[PDB]
Design a protein around this nucleic acid. Structure first.
Ligand SMILES: [Mn+2]
Ligand SMILES: [Mn+2]
Lengths: 929, 295, 93, 295, 295
DNA sequence: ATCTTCCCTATTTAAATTGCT
DNA sequence: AGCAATTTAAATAGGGAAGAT
């Protein structure tokens, strides 16, 4: 590897970086180094070139592509190394940036006018309840609305009038309404409980007129008259001139505001709100010290009076203005040019040369990567990102362990920690034992990286470790919940960090089908927000349903419409890149996405069907599923075994179902040597982790290394009874599976856990589908709702899987890929597709995906909750002693193959099952006994 | 300027994209729309090109022309099949050698002499293939390429009309383009308005060969306005004969290799510089028109 | 013929030689030019680099051997381009 | 220093001549008498040889040894005829991995295991020949080299002692010296004291392969006092035993090509860096000596 | 400055600081800081050391190595050496490992001499305790310390396996730690990660002990990959095993005195090297390794 | 001695402005 | 619009002195 490093630096920051860059490369003179070094040498040079201080101006070239660029060095657009760069390059009708500046400046000088009431003064001094009857943002909104109703609010002297209690402060003037919504929602968004309003309201002001004081601001309301008697000590020199210059800025630019569309207004006001909380939290974090008394805004850690309200308003204004400037004029730090990506894929990765069919100069890209598992999907996503140049992306993945797997792939192929940042925000205690030096695994949290210039506008220089890893990451391999808060939050400033993260970075969401329906709705909201700033969305899901692919394209198309009309460019359409392991297709799609997507789906189906059938599923006829499991285990051991040894996966639905199947199979008298494992999610930290590592090392069938992790000498049935934790994110390879039916994507995923690593075709049948789910004996009205898309609004007419599924069927992604809306009441696949198009629709609703008008409100974050689960309290095992109503028990010790013990950790119990003892056990975790 | 580098030994080669071309402090440079000023070596430049969003000034054009750099503008194609119109500023202030133009005129006006020159220039692409052999792509001396160039030479030997030359021209272009398509395992159709990389790399090489051909013709004073091959489809001037002498030998395998390896356009620019410089394709074209003119 | 020219010069004698050396070679940044040129181009570049005045500090490398060295530039004894150049070195009998 | 480039993954190697090596601003840099201070990439350096007229401070050795750079001197016993003591300081402050010493000395003490290991390292000569081919010199697959490699293998298979081994070395090296010389049309007698380029380039490559071999030894912890070849003219230890794996495959073809193609000492030195990092010879010798000790 | 260290019997390990070593009038001298030159007699020295502020030249290096004066580079103090070559039987006449080295290897190989040498290294560690009596430290003749000594002597003499010797060695070492903690009125528990004065002072004193044991192992040519107590996978375990002899006899009382009076690290370094120079601790380790390896 | 830190020391580059064509 | 003259100033290089090892 031959590199060349050039320095642009002034100071002796052309000198103390010269020591480190002259420790690793030869000096060719004139502050230019050039030579041969290894990739780990590149990583070491990066780590000790960035850590040496601020102001390092370093460009590296590997062959002729730029390896890395330290700082905001413009470096190369076409040629490299410019001459002098001075000022005044373009200076356009910027319009919408002047609009955002005027809105943020006018609102930020009015965002805390409502702290001047006597209640907030005695709240800061501390002789009343610290919770206000009406929040000060609403009081400042009442001030601004009363001033606007009285005088002309855009060109007049200010003077705060006598204000009363107003239920609504939103009128008709679109720009005033924007300023009012920025003022009122500078801490939290208003929440609308009204069902008719949630049913009908769509527009900007027409929804904003329904935002009343009862949506969170009106806490208790007994001291309203003191909350609206206000002093007017803000009339000073610099506050009045700042208010005048920003109001006239808005006055001069609001003529382009009425030429915007609804989508524009929503996205622009979201940006304005994010910059306003950025400036407000930035000025509230630091201590300024000086004060002019008689009025105060915030308190220090000692509770003393600080940050008087005139200079508080001025500081929040300038900090929000500077926030806006750096978030709207940033050339963000991108990743290194990974040299182990750009070469050809060989063999089964040979489809990854589809990036040589995509244009490298497209400003936008919507990848739908429909490639099957085991083909290197995430490597292909990184290849697609690097085809357009240097990489800046957020790999948002479900589960901690899947982020760990993608991080380990990124580490061992070409990516160091100067470009990658693995973020899992829980600090799990799963450590690697055996040998620390001989590990060559366990990707960790260090991020030598490079701190971006956006950290100076965040509160108190961003944060410590976690938010520095969030914001400053070129490549952010993260759990997805660090990105879905970009679309907005209930309370606080947790929106700004993923918002500013997704503003300048691409978004790569892998296996989006494993998320929930509301989770997928907020993920497509994130896709729309990412496309709002021209970034590229890579979706990587093999079993995509047309509905999902369509609504994600429509979210990207609305976002790219926002980005196109935001830079005053005519919208040519979205560069959609359909991708699988058989080919690629790049089309400029502005309309008719459905026929092209279904034609690619049909081409992928015909490229999947002439291949040999790997998963032949038979739906059993035996009604009782206990003895159906027995007979199917006996049949698939007598048919599918490797010299007497067979691996079976009993995929069931819930935990007590799993322990019921386990306790039946343990007490089942047979000549077969059944060896039973329980693989559900309710387990203690230690025990769970141990199951994972063992299962990953015994079900690895790409080699014969497993022969030494199990007793393959004696003919044995190694059976793993598992819940849907096996069908998501597990690289497992079973000889056969017996599936309790809950949803068709569960069938396709548990087919993907059988012969995942081998290529031998089954002869007779490798999957035995149960006749009924076990909830049929508990609830015959609805049985597929647990881990399925059946529900109270979408009920199957019959629950028989002979009626709702094929008796003999080759299970692949084809049934999920096709998409059928008719006959959803008597087939599982059409039931699935129905729900997917009836929840992820092209409407705005309130919990929908095109959400417009409601982004202003708190409604999409309350009624569409990301990871909406049950109450979930956590019973914690502390050194062998349980906390709550747990009561350790003893398992049946009949056929347990492996049982790992646990002493620490915690189990997640729903509040429903907290009533009784969860009865934790070493073999199977939680049950009802 | 002493002895300005003979045009045939001029080496630098650019097509400037999305930058206003100007002069700072003595040298011709181009300034992009981010503040970056990259200098142009005008004393060694063969040609510059101007893509969308480009704007050159007066004294920059003067310093290119007086040094002898042919300058064209890439856009202008508006038909469905043809590279329609490329606008090209000739440095005529340098007074040119004359008798090569007289020889070209004495062969152009005589119809049987133009046909004879048409003959030798059609087999000139055949010998271009034989001389300029790349390390990648196809091998020239295989059975299929030799069979098609043998059929081409046999047909162009017995040809007697320019429309027969146009037909045989079409079968030659279809034969080569499709054989390269077969080698690189793609389906290929030559459309100048296509998003596929094998096509816009071919249009970029069309612009590159256009610039090479006007520098070769201007180095001997030959105008584009004397096309020895003419027709309804083939109406571009002499540049659409001295430019596509070197498609199927130089540009089209290089365009297919660049669209197969699939990095950006700049590696294709630099590869065109490297092959036009290493094998001296400009001096090769000039010397071939030299042995054309005096025979 | 592929050459590479580096400049050691102070003053605007890093500037008015830059016009001539940027008339014949491409700019690779950091006062370093690199590109292909003919031998007569090398002669023309020499003639208009030396005649431009006194204080020209130019080293040219053809492949890896030094083509020319304008001035008393120490340039290369083994490696090329020193750094912390100084006075006081040997001081013998 | 974080992880520090693995010493097989260091690519820079130097032999400095007529300079004062010191540390400036924490920089390993050699200063000549003309006032020129050239830095050294000490965290990427494999070795720094020091020729006549050289000098190095303490701190330069301190931060070369902390970065794992082997420093030797080309005088003393560096006349290369006796090859007794080329003064070669190693960084033993770093506590090296031990297991290669253990397997190496288990086979050393056992004389039959030493004889077998010597045969493996003698076969590594022809292995090096086959792996590292050169396109500017002797083809390895011609009849003379294949015949002499076959004769060398059939002689070293039936070998009984180290005196028999010493003789097979005479044959291989001397006749490969000669075979190159007859193909390079030069009457050549190997002489370390000779002035012709065919010998000064050979001694420079001897020092370069000395540095590569000694860095490969020290990497594994292997010393030099445990050689596999014992003889009257084989004074010098294990570093020459590792180094003469890559005379006739690398050092000798590069030296012969250099002399024939009139390279200067500097470019021969560089050609040596290019071959030692393009084929990754340091990792080759390190992995192959792991194959040698192993059990 | 100029520093003399007796090592075996008659040869002296010269340590040179703040001086420039070169050749004047045909023999090796060095200019010092005061501008006064000092020569060196070749007969009385074999090891010559280059401390901080020291540069040597090439012909001085060559003439020093041709006179049997083998040079090493060390951090200032003379007992923190980072660069040297390997002792042979003779520096010019032949290249053989030293008798001490070979004896060590043979003793290490056969399991019985390895066990006997492990017992012996602990016998001489108890001897070291008594031999090097300090003033500020605890009395070695005290009843508790003598009981610990006799417990260690019984445990080493009655043991037949290495892990028993490791448990007994840890018991003795931390029992002396407990005794010195009982002296200096502190709760002392040995951990490397603590930032208190006693633990970090003992850590850097242990690093000084590792340096002087490394010099003593190098000076008889003993390699750093044959530990007696520590495992085969422990990198540089023989340095730790030899430094164990003086860790609890010299480093521990000096470190506890240094943390008791609380002075800084450089003056603890000067106290450690003053104790090394005054009582000839390196010469004690050299004679210790001779008596171990000779048996 | 070697090397580092810092203070002169002024020598040396980059920007800035502005008539002039 | 490019440039030139010409100021203005920020920074780069170097030498001497003193303090560390
Ligand atoms: Mn507030
Ligand atoms: Mn505030």
């Amino acid at each position: 590897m031959f590199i060349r490093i050039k320095c642009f630096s002034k100071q002796p920051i052309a000198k103390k970086v010269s020591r480190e860059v002259s420790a690793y490369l030869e000096y060719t003179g004139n502050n230019t180094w050039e030579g041969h070094i290894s990739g780990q040498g590149v990583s070491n040079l990066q780590t000790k070139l960035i850590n040496v201080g601020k102001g390092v101006k370093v460009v590296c070239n590997y062959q002729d592509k730029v390896l890395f660029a330290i700082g905001n060095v413009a470096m190369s657009d076409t040629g490299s190394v410019p001459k002098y760069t001075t000022k005044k390059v373009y200076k356009p009708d910027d319009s919408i940036f002047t609009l955002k500046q005027g809105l943020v400046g006018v609102a930020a000088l009015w965002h805390d006018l409502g702290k001047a009431n006597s209640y907030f003064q005695r709240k800061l001094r501390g002789e009343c309840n610290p919770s206000d009857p009406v929040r000060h943002e609403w009081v400042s909104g009442v001030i601004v609305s009363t001033f606007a109703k009285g005088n002309d609010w855009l060109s007049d002297d200010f003077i705060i009038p006598e204000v009363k209690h107003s239920d609504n402060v939103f009128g008709d003037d679109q720009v005033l309404n924007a300023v009012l919504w920025l003022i009122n929602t500078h801490h939290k968004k208003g929440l609308v409980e009204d069902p008719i309003y949630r049913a009908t309201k769509t527009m900007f002001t027409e929804t904003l007129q329904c935002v009343n004081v009862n949506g969170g601001w009106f806490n208790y309301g007994d001291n309203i008259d003191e909350c609206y008697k206000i002093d007017t000590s803000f009339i000073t020199d610099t506050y009045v001139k700042q208010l005048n210059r920003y109001r006239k800025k808005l006055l001069a630019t609001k003529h382009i505001w009425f030429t915007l569309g609804e989508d524009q207004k929503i996205a622009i006001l979201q940006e304005c709100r994010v910059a306003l909380m950025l400036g407000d939290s930035n000025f509230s974090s630091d201590l300024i010290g000086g004060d002019g008394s008689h009025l105060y805004a915030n308190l220090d850690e000692c509770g003393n009076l600080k940050q008087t309200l005139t200079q508080h308003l001025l500081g929040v204004t300038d900090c929000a203005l500077k926030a806006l400037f750096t978030i709207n004029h940033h050339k963000p730090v991108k990743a290194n040019f990974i040299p182990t990506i750009a070469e050809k894929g060989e063999g089964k990765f040979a489809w990854q040369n589809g990036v040589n069919m995509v244009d490298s100069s497209i400003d936008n890209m919507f990848c739908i990567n429909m490639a099957s598992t085991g083909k290197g999907k995430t490597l292909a996503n990184l290849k697609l990102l690097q085809h357009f140049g240097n990489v800046r992306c957020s790999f948002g993945l479900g589960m901690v362990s899947l982020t760990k797997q993608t991080a380990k792939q990124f580490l061992d192929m070409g990516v160091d920690y100067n470009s990658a940042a693995m973020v899992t925000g829980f600090s799990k205690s799963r450590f690697n034992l055996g040998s620390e030096s001989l590990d060559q695994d366990e990707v960790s949290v260090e991020y030598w990286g490079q701190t971006s210039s956006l950290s100076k506008v965040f509160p108190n220089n961003n944060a410590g470790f976690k938010n520095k890893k969030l914001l400053s990451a070129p490549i952010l391999v993260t759990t997805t919940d660090h990105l879905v808060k970009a679309s907005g939050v209930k309370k606080g400033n947790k929106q700004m960090l993923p918002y500013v993260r997704c503003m300048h970075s691409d978004l790569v969401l892998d296996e989006i089908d494993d998320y929930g329906i509301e989770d997928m709705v907020v993920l497509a909201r994130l896709v729309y927000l990412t496309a709002c700033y021209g970034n590229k969305v890579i979706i990587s899901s093999a079993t995509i349903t047309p509905a999902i692919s369509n609504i994600f394209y429509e979210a990207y198309s609305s976002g790219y419409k926002v980005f196109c009309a935001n830079k005053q460019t005519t919208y040519k359409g979205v560069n959609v890149v359909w991708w699988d392991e058989f080919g690629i297709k790049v089309e400029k799609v502005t309309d008719q996405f459905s026929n092209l997507n279904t034609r690619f789906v049909n081409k992928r189906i015909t490229n999947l069907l002439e291949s040999t059938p790997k998963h032949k599923a038979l739906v059993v006829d035996q009604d009782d599923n206990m003895e159906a499991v027995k007979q199917s285990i006996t049949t698939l051991h007598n048919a599918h075994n490797s010299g007497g040894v067979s691996f079976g996966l009993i995929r069931t639905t819930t935990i007590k179902d799993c322990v019921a199947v386990t306790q039946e199979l343990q007490n089942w008298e047979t000549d077969l040597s059944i060896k039973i494992l329980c693989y559900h999610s309710r387990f203690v930290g230690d025990t769970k982790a141990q199951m994972e590592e063992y299962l990953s090392k015994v079900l690895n069938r790409k080699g014969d290394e497993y022969k030494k992790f199990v007793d393959t000498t004696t003919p044995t049935a190694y059976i793993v009874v598992a819940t849907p934790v096996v069908e998501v994110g597990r690289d497992f390879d079973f000889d056969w599976a017996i599936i309790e039916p809950s949803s068709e994507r569960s069938i396709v995923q548990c087919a993907g856990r059988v012969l995942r690593h081998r290529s031998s075709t089954p002869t007779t049948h490798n999957i035995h589908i149960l006749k009924y789910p076990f909830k049929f004996y508990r609830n015959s009205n609805i049985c597929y709702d647990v881990a399925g898309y059946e529900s109270k609004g979408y009920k199957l007419k019959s629950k028989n899987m002979l009626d709702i599924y094929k008796k003999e069927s080759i299970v692949n992604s084809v049934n999920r890929l096709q998409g059928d809306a008719a006959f959803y009441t008597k087939s599982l696949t059409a039931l699935e597709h129905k729900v997917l198009l009836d929840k992820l629709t092209t409407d705005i609703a309130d919990t929908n995906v095109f959400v417009g008008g409601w982004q202003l409100t708190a409604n999409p974050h309350e009624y569409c909750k990301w990871r909406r689960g049950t109450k979930n309290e956590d019973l914690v095992l502390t050194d062998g002693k349980w906390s709550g109503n747990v009561t350790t028990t003893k398992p049946i010790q009949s056929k347990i193959w492996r049982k790992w013990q646990g002493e620490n950790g915690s189990i997640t119990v729903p509040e429903y099952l907290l009533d009784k003892t969860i009865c934790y056990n070493d073999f199977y975790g939680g049950y009802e006994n | 300027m002493q002895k300005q580098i003979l045009t045939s030994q001029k080496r630098n080669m650019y097509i400037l994209s999305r930058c206003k071309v100007l002069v700072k402090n003595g040298q011709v440079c181009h300034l992009h729309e981010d503040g970056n000023v990259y200098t142009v070596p005008y004393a060694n430049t063969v040609f510059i090109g101007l893509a969308e969003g480009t704007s050159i000034t007066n004294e920059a054009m003067s310093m290119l022309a007086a040094n002898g750099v042919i300058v064209f503008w890439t856009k202008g194609g508006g038909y469905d099949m043809f590279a329609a119109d490329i606008i090209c500023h000739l440095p005529q202030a340098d007074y040119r050698p004359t008798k090569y133009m007289q020889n070209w005129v004495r062969l152009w006006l005589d119809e049987e002499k133009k046909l004879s020159a048409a003959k030798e220039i059609l087999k000139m692409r055949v010998d271009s293939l034989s001389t300029h052999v790349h390390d990648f792509g196809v091998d020239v001396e295989n059975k299929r390429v030799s069979s098609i160039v043998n059929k081409f030479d046999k047909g162009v030997t017995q040809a007697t009309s320019f429309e027969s030359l146009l037909g045989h021209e079409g079968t030659f272009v279809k034969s080569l383009y499709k054989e390269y398509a077969l080698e690189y395992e793609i389906e290929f159709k030559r459309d100048h308005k296509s998003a596929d990389n094998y096509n816009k790399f071919l249009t970029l090489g069309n612009y590159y060969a256009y610039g090479i051909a006007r520098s070769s013709l201007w180095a001997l004073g030959i105008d584009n306005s004397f096309p020895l091959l003419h027709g309804s489809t083939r109406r571009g001037g002499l540049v659409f004969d001295v430019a596509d002498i070197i498609k199927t030998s130089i540009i089209l395998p290089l365009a297919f290799h660049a669209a197969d390896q699939g990095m950006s356009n700049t590696e294709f620019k630099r590869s065109c510089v490297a092959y036009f410089d290493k094998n001296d394709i400009l001096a090769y074209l000039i010397n071939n028109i030299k042995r054309l003119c005096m025979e």
